[PDB]
């Protein structure tokens, strides 16, 4: 007994499948994998493979069948991927790989990365109107998850996130932004798991906390959704009844914690919401104060962005909500994580897989009320040897902040891997994301990025390697 897809969603869906069948058809992005024990030899295979693709027999093979065949080869420690829509992009890419040159559509490394990937679940500031729609229409696993979450948020809040996603006329509010990003993050991460990927550790930021508790194995899907639903409605309601003198704003400014100590003397009502990067902090407070701080900063040519909200989460101003939040989470069952956690709620500190559960009711209270230790959890992950950070987001705003912490910590070559992007094709983005995982040697079954062969023309006679 659990809600089905509503009729309005089915109706919006058919309007959406025809808006889409009307559209001018386009070439899919196809990943071409090339690997060997040694780079030297990987380079040789690419150049050969590009010669063959330039040949008539190679020209008569669809990019798909060539990719399918490549994915069945035995994959070695030295690896490359070329990401192509047509033969000419492919060959150009492979030429770049063969010459150890650099190309946007190409990734190539000498051997695997040493530690597993950190999944970054953030979300704040990432929402945009049509987020998730294209990938829902075009991918059946993503859609299945988006629906399983839709069904649960229906049970919890009484409306449908699927209908928000499908409807070009609907923009997002405080509340619906949080549950929609949650939906999107759950079904992204499960799309990755479907293809063999898995997080070594998670780190959450704020709204992302709940999806990150689920990917960590700390809450069931039901409990995690209780966690996103309970806080989001409460902040949306709360924010609604705020006007003028009680209103507090949130803005991101290019000052560090300290630089802000030397403002927050002068401006005493100000509070720190998120420690975002070593030189970026999200603050919240009285709008005369916030505008002041912005005005100072912008004058010094320091980055600044005011956010759309009349209330400031992670501050004393959430105290009215906390008794209610507590009561709404009566009965959630926190479990022992199945992967590492850098907790930005608990000051950036790390919790080991098989540790004592952290996601109790009090976690969500402390999370909503206190600062978010985001730069700290990231500087932690780096100090412990992680270099791959992959963001599940509809637009990777958190990953840029990650860039700033990694560099400030002496890591100048992170694999910073994003998922979805505003104004970028959603299928293609995920193809890339999985192609970067493959390349860096992280878990990712590349076979699964192709449909099962229905006949011989589904393979290609790509150059052989054994004898």
């Amino acid at each position: 007994e659990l809600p089905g897809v509503t009729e309005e969603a089915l109706r919006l869906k058919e309007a959406a499948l025809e808006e889409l069948a009307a559209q001018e058809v386009t070439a899919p992005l196809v990943p071409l994998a090339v690997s060997a024990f040694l780079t030297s030899r990987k380079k040789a295979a690419a150049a050969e493979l590009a010669d063959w693709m330039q040949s008539p027999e190679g020209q008569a093979s669809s990019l798909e069948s060539i990719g399918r065949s490549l994915s069945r080869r035995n994959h070695g420690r030295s690896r490359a991927v070329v990401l192509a829509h047509d033969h000419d992009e492919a060959i150009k890419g492979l030429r770049a790989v063969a010459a150890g040159k650099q190309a946007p559509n190409v990734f190539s490394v000498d051997g695997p990365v040493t530690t597993g990937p950190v999944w970054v679940l953030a979300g704040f500031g990432a929402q945009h109107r049509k987020m998730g729609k294209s990938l829902y229409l075009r991918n059946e696993v993503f859609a299945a998850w988006i629906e399983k979450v839709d069904a649960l948020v229906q049970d919890e809040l009484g409306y449908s996130v699927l209908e928000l996603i499908l409807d070009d006329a609907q923009d997002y509010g405080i509340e619906t932004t949080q549950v929609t990003i949650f939906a999107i993050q759950i079904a992204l991460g499960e799309l990755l798991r479907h293809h063999g990927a898995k997080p070594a550790a998670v780190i959450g930021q704020s709204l992302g906390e709940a999806a990150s508790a689920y990917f960590a194995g700390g809450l069931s899907l039901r409990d995690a959704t209780r966690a996103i639903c309970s806080r989001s409605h409460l902040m949306g309601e709360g924010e609604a009844m705020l006007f003028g003198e009680y209103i507090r704003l949130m803005a991101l400014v290019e000052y560090s914690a300290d630089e802000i100590r030397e403002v927050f003397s002068d401006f005493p009502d100000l509070e720190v919401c998120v420690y975002a990067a070593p030189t970026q902090t999200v603050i919240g407070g009285p709008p005369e104060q916030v505008d002041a701080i912005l005005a100072r900063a912008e004058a010094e040519g320091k980055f600044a962005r005011k956010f759309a909200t009349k209330g400031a989460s992670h501050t004393s101003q959430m105290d009215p909500l906390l008794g209610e939040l507590t009561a709404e989470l009566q009965g959630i069952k926190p479990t022992s994580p199945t992967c590492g956690i850098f907790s930005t709620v608990h000051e950036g500190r790390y919790i080991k897989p098989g540790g004592e559960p952290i996601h109790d009711v009090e976690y969500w209270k402390k999370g909503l009320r206190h600062s978010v230790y985001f730069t700290h959890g990231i500087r932690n992950a780096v100090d412990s040897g992680h270099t791959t950070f992959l963001e599940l987001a509809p637009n990777p705003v958190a990953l840029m902040q990650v860039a700033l912490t990694t560099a400030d910590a002496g890591l100048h070559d992170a694999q910073l891997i994003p998922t979805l992007a505003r104004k970028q094709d959603e299928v293609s983005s995920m193809v890339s994301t999985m192609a970067q995982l493959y390349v860096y040697g992280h878990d990712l079954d590349i076979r699964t990025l192709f449909s099962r062969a229905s006949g011989p023309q589904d393979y290609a006679n790509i150059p052989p390697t054994r004898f």
Binding site: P104, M400, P418, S428, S432
Partner: peptide, 10 residues
């Protein structure tokens, strides 16, 4: 600062 077609700082 930007992310491109395939997930790079651009």
């Amino acid at each position: 600062d930007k992310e491109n077609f395939w997930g790079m700082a651009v």
